[PDB]
Design a protein around this nucleic acid. Sequence first.
DNA 1: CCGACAGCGCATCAGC
DNA 2: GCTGATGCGC
DNA 3: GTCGG
Length: 326
Amino acid sequence: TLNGGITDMLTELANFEKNVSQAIHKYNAYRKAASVIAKYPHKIKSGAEAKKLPGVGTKIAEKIDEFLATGKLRKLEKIRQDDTSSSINFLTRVSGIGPSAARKFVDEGIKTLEDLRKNEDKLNHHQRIGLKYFGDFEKRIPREEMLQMQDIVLNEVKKVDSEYIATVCGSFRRGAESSGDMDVLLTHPSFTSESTKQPKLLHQVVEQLQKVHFITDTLSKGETKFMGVCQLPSKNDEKEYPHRRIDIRLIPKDQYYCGVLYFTGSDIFNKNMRAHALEKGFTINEYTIRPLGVTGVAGEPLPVDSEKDIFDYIQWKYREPKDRSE
DNA sequence: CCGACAGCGCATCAGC
DNA sequence: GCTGATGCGC
DNA sequence: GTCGG
Ligand SMILES: Nc1nc2c([nH]c(=O)n2[C@H]2C[C@H](O)[C@@H](COP(=O)(O)OP(=O)(O)OP(=O)(O)O)O2)c(=O)[nH]1
Ligand SMILES: [Ca+2]
Ligand SMILES: [Ca+2]
Ligand code: NA
Ligand code: NA
């Protein structure tokens, strides 16, 4: 991490713009700059050097100059000393509490972990579970545990219907040695873009994983997306494993490649790739890549038989999952 | 100078 | 109950 | 906050 100090600074600024200022585009701008700097293979010596990189503008170059000179940024030093900003920033670390709910809570005088813990009845379901596992959700998951979790999920799915295919995506698929949480793409031949020949396809899998005490809590659930909590089983006299976040996404089977492209990420990589897509006259989502007509309206879905086919349309050389960690 | 910035699932709520 | 906006999440 | 046109 040649430029750890700079990228940390930019990420902190991004988080401020998202959580406090509620300026989503400034947030994305800061994260884009951080990402491009993170991959730059030289230790940055100046703002001018950084300003050569796409996403790094005049304002950021100036901040980089301040940071390199003094080891800090006055702007951030202040934000840190602001009570309302500090509190809002903290509260948003709970899953289910966003910028709006955080500011609302601060208004009501709820601004610490202790405050939340004695005001559970003021939280919705998602927030209450977010609070419950606040500490656990802070922890990362060693790849070794991710592998054990993979085994459990794939084996339990197979026991429901051997025609299910479950794929672990996210940072795990990108080869990371540790992951923030588990993401599972699910397909079944009964669910395609042309028909749903069977109901409760996602439900049956969730139920099974709850049955073996793998899924422990539910944050939200619909016909195609599950968001919840899971936990590896522990051995005799062993301390329990931390509870982990799990997301499961049921995708039409004939749209697997667009699905897996999306679910593999990273998030910044996806934003960059979809952005480039627009520049190139296409629109990409987790289902399809379509041409944009002169009207601006998306045309019909183009044939896709691989992740590479999607890269081909937008004239990008294929990049393996491990090189999508932006 | 300024329009545009990726795209979408589920939960919650106001209005009807 | 439905629909569209909003919040929050991926 | 940055960028393309
Ligand atoms: N968190 C997040 N994920 C997004 C966004 N947009 C988008 O396409 N995704 C996709 C790509 C991500 O790799 C995928 C899974 O989300 P994730 O938060 O679990 O991220 P991850 O596996 O890459 O990283 P991590 O768990 O190790 O922290 O969702 C977004 O705005 N936020
Ligand atoms: Ca993940
Ligand atoms: Ca996730
Ligand atoms: Na630049
Ligand atoms: Na949050």
